Amino acid sequence: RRVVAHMPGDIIIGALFSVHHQPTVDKVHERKCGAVREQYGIQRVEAMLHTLERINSDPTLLPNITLGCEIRDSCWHSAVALEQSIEFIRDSKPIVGVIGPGSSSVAIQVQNLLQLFNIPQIAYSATSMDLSDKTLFKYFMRVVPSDAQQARAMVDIVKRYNWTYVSAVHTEGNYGESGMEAFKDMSAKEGICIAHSYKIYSNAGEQSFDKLLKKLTSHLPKARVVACFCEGMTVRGLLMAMRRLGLAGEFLLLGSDGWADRYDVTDGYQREAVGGITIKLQSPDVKWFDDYYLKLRPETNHRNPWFQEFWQHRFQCRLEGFPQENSKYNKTCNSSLTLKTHHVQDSKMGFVINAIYSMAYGLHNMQMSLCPGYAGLCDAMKPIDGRKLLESLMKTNFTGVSGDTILFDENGDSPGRYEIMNFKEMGKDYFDYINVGSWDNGELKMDDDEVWSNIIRSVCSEPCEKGQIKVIRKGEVSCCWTCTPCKENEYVFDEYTCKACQLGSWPTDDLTGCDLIP
């Protein structure tokens, strides 16, 4: 079986974090998960633990009530997170609520199970619009906004930089498909041609991404910008295919939140990602998490089982006498090693902690609306009713960890803002992400001089020169036209269609109207 991160308490809350990577396509049926993950894994687990410690310490939030947890590996895989959710359901101390998981596609698979047992789920990174259906997903909520905004923002970015003929790639799954189809419905309505829409799984082989990159160079040179509604490793695979083929620098990738500022995606293939514009969600680094995490040591921390593996992996050494020692690494772990070296905090850590607080404050509102005087759990919440917990969680009005009031709408979604990033070079051979814009409630603000300072053109046809040249569409696509001139008697009515002057009249010098022949 899989080891779990256990913590006792008067109320145990479930958690699903991607401690390991998705199992290799070879051993998928075996469900043998891949390498350990820090930001989406270990860090989120320790955040769960410490946040529950704080909720216990806090006398205002849930007084006389201890919060325990059962933290299980999601592996960013539907089947693995579903087996572990079954291990949550195994009882029917019961699991009151569930936090996570990461991928919207996996979150649906989990929700489908949890809803049957009235267990409210709160996702930190699942953004898909389909999860806004509360008839399909009654007991689902998320602290991040629907992707109907992020798609609109991506469309607005395409609009601002006068891009019309674009290629479109998305990760095969609910997140990618929902986002891409919303981008299709919005861009096409706003007059943006989609050269071709491509879908690929994140764990597809090298040859598969090579084929994808070749199919992307099929539309070159017209369609250079690639609207990517791709999670992480999909963008990474694209960059690695650009290294393999040599098609680097020829495209411009417009990534979604799957590649917000993730260094694990661009590290090692920096030149290939240069110029890429991506979308992040408004999550300021949670101050007190770094103070807890960076002080952690493998000798001290003994509640996270994977911390031994993760410590041996991040430093690539073997913890000499420790229990879960792995002989693989040729080096031995020194006492000088510390996490502060090359520390990169999880981008969505704020949402993780805010979701844990969402569950806590929902339980507290239910506590006050059922056991007013009794300090702690009374006989009315023995047992805790899941339906009442959902009704109290939807009506939660609290101030978040980022100093911003978190609230939930009718569809169980939370409001959100986005930061637009750019992977440019900050110096010779050095590359890093930089904030270049923002998107909130429709308004898109950008610093246009920071992105290019150099400009890129991704259109299928250059605007017809003013004089008399009309826009005549080609064989198939709208944005593809052939600038054809007008007859001497014809004046240009509108950009698209030409109109002829009647007998005696003749087109004016500006070719906007007619004028009598002298």
């Epitope: 229990p323 879960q324 020692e325 792995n326």
Partner: nanobody, 123 residues
């Protein structure tokens, strides 16, 4: 909730050999490390040998170095301690204990015990 059973002990002559077994109940024995330690009457308890949760990497006390060997078959879900050329100072109650999460052995947090097998080495 894992339960351990010790076996293999008894009584042996001076310089003889004796092999020790310890079996665990339930899965996730592969997730726990294992360490045998002995305790004699009056004397305080001494950590004998230890093997990592994955196996392969082993540690021994200076007293039993070059004399004992600890091993484990995870498929059998069992750990073993072969005590070649025993001495009279080895007479004690040997215990087998599981430890997920420790530090450099002998510093481990043992969070499961076993019954205990009595080993008597006659002069």
């Amino acid at each position: 909730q894992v339960q351990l059973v010790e076996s293999g002990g008894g009584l042996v002559q001076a310089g003889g050999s004796l092999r020790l077994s310890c079996a665990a109940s339930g899965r996730t024995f592969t997730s726990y490390a294992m360490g045998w330690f002995r305790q004699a009457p009056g004397k305080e308890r001494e950590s004998v040998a230890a093997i990592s949760s994955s196996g392969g990497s082993t540690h021994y006390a200076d007293s039993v170095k070059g004399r004992f060997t600890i091993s484990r078959d995870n498929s059998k879900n069992t750990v073993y301690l072969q005590m070649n050329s025993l001495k009279p100072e080895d007479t004690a109650v040997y215990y087998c204990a599981a430890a997920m999460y420790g530090s450099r052995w002998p510093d481990w947090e043992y969070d499961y015990w076993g019954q205990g097998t009595q080993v008597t080495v006659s002069s």
